[PDB]
């Protein structure tokens, strides 16, 4: 493969009749085309438009008008989708996609939330729990716990890493619980004795933080 799609940010919250811009950074691009698929709750995923690079031409699919969805050039490697005059029926998860021969590669997606209600957009507030000596004694392993609480919207992306390995560790994530203007998520990571006393780092991405992730250093 080798193709990599990057979509920032993870979520976009707007009121009706506003506009939204979604980014798709393509690394090592094989195809000249960027496809934009939409995932809505209850219906099958479908493609909205196909954007031609080097032509800067957005071709929408049947059922979608160019005055509603249109892609443009962002940076010199970014495809920028703009969805204008937002209605509630525009809410969904928007994935960009590129062909790699016979297989099609997708991005992690960007959730578009269009509500007819006033919203607050508050960032996650983390509290951490460090491993106890009792657990290291009777399990030969330590458990780190992170609780992100009181954030809006209900879209967050968290991951754990080890200082020097560029691949997130295998941790457990709970569901995003909450309602109204306050949502929470818990996540924990268990590591062994030979992995303990190694500087860890914890990341979380939220809409109220921009495109860069917030980082936390743990020892």
């Amino acid at each position: 493969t080798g193709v990599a799609l990057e979509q920032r940010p993870i979520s976009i919250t707007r009121n009706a009749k506003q506009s939204a811009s979604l980014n798709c950074k393509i690394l090592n691009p094989v195809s000249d085309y960027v496809h934009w698929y939409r995932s809505q709750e209850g219906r099958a995923p479908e493609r909205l438009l196909v954007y031609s690079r080097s032509k800067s031409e957005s071709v929408p699919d049947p059922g979608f008008s160019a005055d509603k969805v249109r892609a443009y050039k962002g940076a010199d490697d970014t495809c920028r989708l703009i969805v204008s005059d937002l209605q509630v029926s525009d809410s969904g998860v928007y994935h960009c996609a590129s062909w790699d021969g016979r297989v099609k590669v997708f991005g992690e997606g960007t959730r578009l939330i269009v509500t007819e209600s006033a919203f607050k957009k508050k960032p996650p507030k983390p509290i951490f729990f460090l491993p106890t000596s009792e657990e290291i004694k009777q399990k030969q392993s330590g458990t780190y716990i992170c609780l992100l609480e009181d954030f809006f919207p209900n879209v967050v992306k968290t991951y754990w890493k080890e200082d020097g390995n560029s691949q997130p560790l295998d941790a457990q994530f709970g569901p995003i619980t909450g309602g109204g203007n306050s949502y929470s998520q818990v996540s924990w990571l268990t590591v062994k004795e030979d992995v303990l006393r190694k500087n860890l780092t914890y990341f979380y991405q939220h809409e109220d933080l921009g495109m860069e992730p917030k980082a936390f250093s743990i020892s």
Partner: protein
């Protein structure tokens, strides 16, 4: 005066729609009515016109000549209906107008309203019906199926994609007009040319194999502009396989504002956890249960209390019973 058109809806290509228009404030009989259509904004085109007082001259435009029928209800109403040849390109905003001089020429049709939103969606001829979803124990073999309809199955390219919330859609395996594609080992696909079906076969199921499985069809012109047509998909949940009952390890952590009760490596998943301060339940406490890759379950019960407080986590995960208490 006041023209209010009231019709239009979200339908699919090959449906019927009947548009109404309430006319109030003038002598309905004397004047003729008409219907207009605009793709998205302006450029209203005269598509239908009806004569005076349930008249005799109803003239349609070549756009809807053989699938339209305009009528009027003299109790303040005008009706225009499009037949089942209703495509997606005759979709937009429809307006209602009333006709209303030698040296002073006026516009023939006037008194438009806000229009009515009619959105006809296209109807896909590619039908894909996934089946075989449910809950599976780990280590079992998953076998999904797709009933395909409406296209040449033999020379088609059909794939299986895994959709999981928070993850990028992932291609598992597929088929084309040749031999096996990525069909060695865990993830496998096959086909039945007689019944126009494609199958997925995943062996040694793991917890990571949960998600929404869609079989997809590649349609287009054969270049990188082709699209994938997906079905609704079928949901697959993976449970840990049955094993010996294992009692959990309970631990208690603090963060000067909250309390975490850590319950590790128990089976079955049924347990009861409760956080008490002084014999009473604490302010907030929400449980989070998740199965581990080791085959057992873990749980975390978080709550909030002060640092200079006594708290007790009570865990009941069998006949057995466990209490963890921090004094003040």
């Amino acid at each position: 005066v006041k023209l209010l058109e009231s019709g239009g809806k979200v339908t699919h290509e090959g449906q019927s729609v009947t548009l109404t228009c309430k006319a109030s404030g003038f002598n309905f009989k004397d004047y003729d009515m008409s219907w207009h259509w605009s793709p998205s904004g302006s450029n209203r085109q005269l598509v239908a016109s009806i004569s005076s007082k349930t008249g005799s001259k109803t003239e349609y435009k070549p756009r809807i000549q053989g699938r339209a029928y305009i009528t009027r209800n003299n109790e303040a109403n005008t009706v225009s209906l499009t037949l089942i040849q209703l495509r997606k390109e005759d979709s937009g905003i429809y307006y209602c107008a009333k006709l209303e001089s030698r040296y002073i020429i006026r516009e023939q049709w006037g008194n438009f309203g806000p229009g009515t939103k009619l959105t006809v969606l296209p109807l896909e001829k590619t039908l894909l019906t996934e089946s075989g979803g449910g809950t599976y124990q780990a280590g079992k073999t998953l076998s999904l199926k797709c009933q395909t309809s409406g296209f040449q199955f033999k020379t088609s390219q059909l794939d299986w994609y895994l959709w999981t919330p928070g993850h990028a859609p992932l291609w598992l395996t597929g088929l084309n007009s040749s031999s096996t594609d990525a069909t060695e080992g865990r993830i496998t696909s096959s086909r039945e040319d007689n019944k126009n079906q494609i199958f997925l076969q995943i062996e040694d199921l793991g917890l990571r194999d949960s998600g929404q499985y869609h079989c997809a069809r590649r349609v287009g012109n054969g270049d990188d502009t082709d699209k994938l047509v997906f079905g609704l998909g079928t949901r697959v949940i993976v449970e840990p396989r049955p094993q010996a009952p294992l009692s959990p390890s309970v631990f208690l952590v603090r963060d000067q504002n909250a309390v975490a009760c850590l319950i590790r490596n128990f089976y079955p998943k049924e347990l009861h956890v409760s956080l008490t301060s002084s014999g009473t339940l604490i302010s907030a406490q929400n449980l989070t249960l998740a199965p581990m890759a080791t085959g057992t379950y873990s749980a975390i019960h978080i709550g909030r209390v002060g640092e200079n407080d006594a708290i007790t986590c009570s865990v009941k995960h069998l006949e057995k019973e466990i209490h963890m208490s921090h004094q003040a």
